[PDB]
Design a protein around this ligand. Sequence first.
Ligand SMILES: [K+]
Ligand SMILES: [K+]
Ligand SMILES: [K+]
Ligand SMILES: [K+]
Ligand SMILES: [K+]
Ligand SMILES: [Mg+2]
Ligand SMILES: [Mg+2]
Ligand SMILES: [Mg+2]
Ligand SMILES: [Mg+2]
Ligand SMILES: [Mg+2]
Ligand SMILES: [Mg+2]
Ligand SMILES: [Mg+2]
Ligand SMILES: [Mg+2]
Ligand SMILES: [Mg+2]
Ligand SMILES: [Mg+2]
Ligand SMILES: [Mg+2]
Ligand SMILES: [Mg+2]
Ligand SMILES: [Mg+2]
Lengths: 167, 49, 204, 159, 271, 49
Amino acid sequence: QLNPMREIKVQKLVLNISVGESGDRLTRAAKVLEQLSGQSPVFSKARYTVRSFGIRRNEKIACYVTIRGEKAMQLLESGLKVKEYELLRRNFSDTGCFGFGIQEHIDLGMKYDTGIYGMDFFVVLERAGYRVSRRRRCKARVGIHQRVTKEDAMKWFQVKYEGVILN
Amino acid sequence: PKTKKILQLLRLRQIFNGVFLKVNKATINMLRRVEPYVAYGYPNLKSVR
Amino acid sequence: GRRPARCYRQIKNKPYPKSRYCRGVPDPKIRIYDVGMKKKGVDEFPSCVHLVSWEKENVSSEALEAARIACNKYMTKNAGKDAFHLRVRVHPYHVLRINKGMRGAFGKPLGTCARVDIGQVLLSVRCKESNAVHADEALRRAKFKFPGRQKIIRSRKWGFTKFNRADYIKYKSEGRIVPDGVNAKLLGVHGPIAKRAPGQAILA
Amino acid sequence: PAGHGLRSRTRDLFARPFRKKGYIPLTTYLRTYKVGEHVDVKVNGAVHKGMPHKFYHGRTGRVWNVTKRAIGVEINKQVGNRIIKKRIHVRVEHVQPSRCNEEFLQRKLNNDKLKAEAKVRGEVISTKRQPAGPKPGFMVEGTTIETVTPIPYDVVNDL
Amino acid sequence: KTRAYSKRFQVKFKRRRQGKTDYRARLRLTNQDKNKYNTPKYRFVVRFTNKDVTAQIVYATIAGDIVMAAAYSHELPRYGLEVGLTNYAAAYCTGLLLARRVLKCRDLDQEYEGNVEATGEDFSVEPADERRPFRALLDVGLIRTTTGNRVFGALKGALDGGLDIPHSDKRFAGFKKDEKQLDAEIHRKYIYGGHVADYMKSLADEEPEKYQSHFSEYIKKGIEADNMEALYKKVHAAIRADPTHKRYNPKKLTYEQRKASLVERLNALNS
Amino acid sequence: AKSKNHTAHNQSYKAHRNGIKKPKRQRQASTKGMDPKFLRNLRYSRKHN
RNA sequence: GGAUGCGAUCAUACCAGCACUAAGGCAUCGGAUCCCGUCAGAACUCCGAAGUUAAGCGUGCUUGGGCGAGAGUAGUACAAGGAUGGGUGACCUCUUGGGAAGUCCUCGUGUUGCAUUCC
RNA sequence: GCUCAACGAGAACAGAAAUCUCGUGUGGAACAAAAGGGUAAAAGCUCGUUUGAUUCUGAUUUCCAGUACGAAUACGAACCG
RNA sequence: UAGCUGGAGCCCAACGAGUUCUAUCAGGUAAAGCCAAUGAUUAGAGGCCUAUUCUCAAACUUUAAAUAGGUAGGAUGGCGCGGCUGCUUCGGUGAGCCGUGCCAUGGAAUCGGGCUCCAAGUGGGCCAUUUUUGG
Ligand SMILES: [K+]
Ligand SMILES: [K+]
Ligand SMILES: [K+]
Ligand SMILES: [K+]
Ligand SMILES: [K+]
Ligand SMILES: [Mg+2]
Ligand SMILES: [Mg+2]
Ligand SMILES: [Mg+2]
Ligand SMILES: [Mg+2]
Ligand SMILES: [Mg+2]
Ligand SMILES: [Mg+2]
Ligand SMILES: [Mg+2]
Ligand SMILES: [Mg+2]
Ligand SMILES: [Mg+2]
Ligand SMILES: [Mg+2]
Ligand SMILES: [Mg+2]
Ligand SMILES: [Mg+2]
Ligand SMILES: [Mg+2]
């Protein structure tokens, strides 16, 4: 259906950095997200003690941030440019979300010569009316005709960033 | 004790004592609980007189 | 060895299963419950005979295994290893205690036994009609391993199903029985209509 | 105390009924109780304040006091030779109004109306209940009669 | 899902499943002391839609809630207010209108005339010592009670209308968290629409293109930022003066229609 | 030497010799334990009758 | 024949998958000055009225799952009282009373209060 | 204010378990402890403010002789959060 | 120490009752269930999953008896009129109580006469039908 309310837009983009420890590495990791977003990043603690990774309970090991609006549009454009608009078929989840990775944030543009850091890009695609599942009063499911699935998300990437899905 | 009480309400305190009982649901279910201790039936005019 | 079965023959206690409150229980002697051709189609064996217990008593795991072996060996020899299916219909779930003076006499586990009642099927054999007489002989040999009184009864059902032979055949002609091993589920009139197949959807 | 705690052997008694847990309906909370009324006591295990002892579950008693969140209930307890009129306070969640006199309350109004008519007409009546008694004679027309017979015994169909 | 899941599932209360009622809060709002017997606890229900303000005086019975009096924002044009029917000012107007209506019903309006000029600070109508003022409890619902929430605009209107509502001033528009006191001047500005009027001035000058599209119905009605104080002042005075089937859905099929359709589908699969 | 621990044998027979005693039904049930509010108020109302 | 606010009962009301809806109301929706709010105007809060019934909400359908009522299971299982009843016993009869539960089969899928309002 | 265990599909390093995202999720988690009950806009988790874990005696429940102690409940008269 | 018993009385005669009936509450034992949660447990069938399948539970359970349990079945009730309250309500609004005038054919069956003091002995029990634990 060609309803004008049935247009896919980026709900939010989440930049994840997972260092695995705390100290100067985490602080320099956070500053990179500060530069690329303009908002204070939020740290994430560890939930289990795992000897192989060398992490204890309630230890700061990662950091992330949520961006929405034109800023997340430009960040996704530059991030997908690093891939040269070459995603993968597996990269798309079946709920209408996809992501990729960046090995080095220098390709995003900032010189940062803080150090050498990568990030996990994840992007949530949604249509209008998704508020019904997040508003406090009268919560409800968003309805299958208003949901974004893998077919729409893959089509959305093909025609917006001239991207090609690899197999 | 339950058999002892019911036979007191029917006034059957001794063996070979006899009484007249009028029939209703209340009395009949009283009689069913003391069935092994008693013999009864429907009397006729010759018996009553 | 162990005490004679007369010491535990009568059902005197409440059931005492192996559980979190009863630990250190030796394993049952009987571990196999189906012998012969177990993976035989439901349309192959229409003959069914039962060894039915006529007493309410305990039956040990030992007595169950001995009867299974004795019933099995005659059937394979006198009818063929391929001509029958024999099923033990009782599982030993009761734990018997032994107190090895009377101070603190609660006993430790001794063995496992089944609790059976009158009319309870002990053993079942499904074969073909030509071998039904041999089926009575193997059940007759098996009953000497059990305490108490047992009967051998010719079942009216087709094989191990719950269907009488007069009605299992009637359903088969109508195209209303789907064979799942030995169970022969009788499809009916419920569920999605698209779930059925051409010829397998019946009104009422 | 002395071998058994307050809620001993109440595992089934104080449990909630199946698929009837969670919220407590508003009807429980805005029923009105007055002194002299009859109420049944039924503990519910989700409300722990005002909880009566397990003896009073399933007993009916009179209301003798009313407070903000509870009512006073009078319940008979047999202690050896005699009955002790126990007086306990229970929160409204564990109490429901009793219907042990509902049939009596309506009957009393009806007996008043029936005796009112006898006053107008000048008659004398009873309006007193009588147990079910012997049925009067009656006739039944000639219809079909089905014959019932003992059935021959079948061994196979006994199970 | 599994049939075992369905067999053991217990459904919540219907208005909980709809996400419309906090049953913990409703219990504490309606539960009355037992030695008060049939005395009802009255509620001051204030609800905001996307376009309307609902105000109701409600008490609970067995058969359901019973309303003593109701008022709406959408009937405010009958008094003079046609725009901004969901802001802090119209919330104050709805609260004042409801309070005037209840006092009329109970013959208390003349005895308890509240503030007739929307003072802008904390108010409580003083009990007359012979007939106490009508007492209701504010029921906010599922909204978040923040400082300056419009529900406290309606609360302020009911207080000025003459109702006794147990409250505090910590949540009126104007309270300062770093000072623990209320600015009655900022509160009066909100009650008379100053925060909206400041926006119109902060839109008509620097971004006229945004000003036209944003306050379109204001412009279409010819309302300017300088008429708001007089517009809301007249409404309060006006309220205090005269406060008083073709079927379009299908029906359920019958047995003789449901079974008739089933015979056709079953043969279609069979053949 | 061990002995018996507990029994209710003969206890209910003992309880029924002077068969179970129901308390005397009295008009004007005692007001003790009623809430002191509405108790002093009832006292004040009676005093001012 | 509809809605909205607040409810009663709390699955005949739930769950799963499909289809459709006039008016109005709801809702989705636009924005971030002010109050408020977070990593994030996503949520919450405040101010609005360009667009839309796509979603939500409402209604209907399915030889649907569940839930509810029947019939049947079955006078079966069990169990109150009685027997100088049978039997070596296990147990089981009869007599005076009470009386269940799965499978299977059939049907159903809400009712309703106060206020305002749309046709 | 929020929702737990677990599962499904996803994102460089990073895999069975490191962090992020969406969907399902009647509790399959958690609630110091034994076990049993009980609890989902909570009784669980996170944050804000706090000391009612306060004063005065009475009454009732459990044990029961219907004594004491312990423990608990419903009021009253204060002072507070 | 309470209970069971005697003696002494005394106070009175509608009140009750080791019983049924009518109505209304409460229960998780027997049975049953697993083709329902927790746990145990045999076997194939079709594609780890799905639909079946044999057998189980004092410290499992959705359902769920019989027998026993509690309450009620009027004169110690009701209705007007008038008062009192320092309690309660927006409010004679309620909750009670006080006074006063009327009304109440006795409200199922059956049976029946029932507050205090002083004290004795007892506080080894045993047996039987049914239920039941250890062995
Ligand atoms: K034998
Ligand atoms: K114990
Ligand atoms: K059952
Ligand atoms: K099971
Ligand atoms: K003594
Ligand atoms: Mg034993
Ligand atoms: Mg002690
Ligand atoms: Mg709240
Ligand atoms: Mg001895
Ligand atoms: Mg002794
Ligand atoms: Mg927005
Ligand atoms: Mg729609
Ligand atoms: Mg159905
Ligand atoms: Mg616990
Ligand atoms: Mg405490
Ligand atoms: Mg049990
Ligand atoms: Mg059993
Ligand atoms: Mg003595």
